[PDB]
Curated annotation (Swiss-Prot), chain B:
This is Spike protein S2. Mediates fusion of the virion and cellular membranes by acting as a class I viral fusion protein. Under the current model, the protein has at least three conformational states: pre-fusion native state, pre-hairpin intermediate state, and post-fusion hairpin state. During viral and target cell membrane fusion, the coiled coil regions (heptad repeats) assume a trimer-of-hairpins structure, positioning the fusion peptide in close proximity to the C-terminal region of the ectodomain. It comes from Human coronavirus HKU1 (isolate N1) (HCoV-HKU1). The gene is S.
Amino acid sequence: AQVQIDRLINGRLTALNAYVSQQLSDISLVKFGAALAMEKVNECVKSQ
Amino acid sequence: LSEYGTFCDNINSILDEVNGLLDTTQLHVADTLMQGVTLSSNLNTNLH
């Protein structure tokens, strides 16, 4: 049962690593977008 | 491989979204190049 459960642990831990890598990349895109939104607030809303 | 089939679905989906981002980016660059451009119909670059 340890052999079967180890195969499931490897698959599920690989799944989490893949999801974590995707999440790191997506949050970098969100940070770039939030900096752009702050720049648009400062340079289009509060001033021109 | 069918036991891991979700890995291939995620790999295909991530590459498809990445390619969609490249296509959307290229359209935005082309739109930026074409924004506000007005040309004369009389403009013929063979003479002008």
